[PDB]
Amino acid sequence: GEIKVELEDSDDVAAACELRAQLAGVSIASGILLRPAVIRNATTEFSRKKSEDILAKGGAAVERASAAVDRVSGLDKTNETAQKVRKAAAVAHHALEHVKEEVEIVAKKVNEIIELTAGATEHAKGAKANGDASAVKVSNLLARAKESENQYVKEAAEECSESTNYDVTAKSLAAALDKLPGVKEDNAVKTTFQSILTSLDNLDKDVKSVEQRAEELETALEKAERQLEKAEKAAEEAETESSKV
């Protein structure tokens, strides 16, 4: 159905012109808001694979260290060289427990980004569908005002050009709606307008969350890299000292 409230004066017409330009610009605003999460989400298979590579190198190192300990199992507790081997291998095992803790955090963040980006995608689709649909209805209202018997309304409606505002935010759209309280509350559009504002604010939140989980992911990969380095150096020592016998 159509908006039933009639634009009453020149200022209402100017406000409806601006509102229509904002509603028309919700589609591109939502794609701009979504863009970084779509880019980020596309990195995650690489980060996930990096964490998996780290785990495989860590497992291989610890087993080489464990093999070095077995080679010296015949040397007694007092043998200086066997002791460096046993201590180094214990370091490599302990460091691998932390590799695994950090790689688990990386997996958690990857899954969080996947979930948040799928939700954000749905918010952007909903904001676009409702911004496009309500823009049609406000455009109809402005086309009707061109036939108004009120000469000031008709004149203002003829001066209103079809345009898209490329800088729309939930904040600016809410300000534009609040200038036309009769239209904001009209049953043909009221819930549509509220859904755009909720969808854009959820989209914005979700993308901020994605970028925060992505920083957390990167911090854990760094820690996993550090713990891997410890495990690999300690395993090297275990092998090198084992070779001396």
Q: Could you tell me which residues come within 8 angstroms of residue 219 by beta carbon, excluding any fewer than 6 positions away?
A: none
Distances in Å between the Cα of 2 and the Cα atoms of 25, 116, 137, 245 are 21, 35, 6, 90
Write down the residue that tokens 């948040």 correspond to.
116
Closest of 135, 133, 129, 118 to residue 203, by C-alpha:
118
214, two tokens: 């992505």
Does residue 183 contact residue 19 with C-beta atoms inside 8 Å? Answer: yes
Q: Give φ, ψ of 192 to 5 degrees.
A: -60, -45
d(CA 47, CA 193): 39
224, two tokens: 């996993």
Distances in Å between the Cα of 122 and the Cα atoms of 37, 101, 116, 131, 233 are 12, 32, 10, 14, 47
Distances in Å between the Cα of 23 and the Cα atoms of 70, 131, 171, 197, 220 are 72, 5, 12, 11, 41
Which ranges constitute the DSSP H helices of the chain?
10-24, 26-71, 80-145, 151-159, 170-178, 181-184, 190-244
Does residue 55 contact residue 225 with C-beta atoms inside 8 Å? Answer: no
CB burial class (10 A; 0-12, 13-18, 19+) of residue 243?
exposed
Q: Could you tell me which residues come within 8 angstroms of residue 39 by beta carbon, excluding any fewer than 6 positions away?
A: none
User: What one-character DSSP code corresponds to residue 150?
Assistant: S
* Encoded amino acid at 5, one letter: V
d(CA 78, CA 238): 16
Closest of 170, 193, 168 to residue 180, by C-alpha:
193
Breaks in the chain (C to N > 2.5 A) come right after none
181, two tokens: 């309280």
50 annotated as ligand-binding = yes
2, two tokens: 């159509």
Closest of 145, 129, 203 to residue 169, by C-alpha:
203
**Resolution expressed in Å:** 1.6
Distances in Å between the Cα of 137 and the Cα atoms of 40, 70, 150 are 36, 79, 21
Out of 3.40.50.10710, 3.30.70.3040, 2.60.120.380, 1.20.1260.80, which CATH number does the structure's domain 1-245 have? 1.20.1260.80
* Encoded amino acid at 126, one letter: G
142, two tokens: 């402005």
Does residue 184 contact residue 177 with C-beta atoms inside 8 Å? Answer: yes
Torsion of CA 116, 119, 125, 127, to 10 degrees: -90
d(CA 110, CA 102): 12
- Within 13 Å and on the Cβ side, how many CA atoms surround 224? 27
Q: Could you tell me which residues come within 8 angstroms of residue 229 by beta carbon, excluding any fewer than 6 positions away?
A: none
40 annotated as ligand-binding = yes
DSSP secondary structure string for all residues of 72-134: TTTS-TT-HHHHHHHHHHHHHHHHHHHHHHHHHHHHHHHHHHHHHHHHHHHHHHHHHHHHHHH
d(CA 114, CA 116): 6
d(CA 54, CA 97): 12
d(CA 229, CA 198): 47
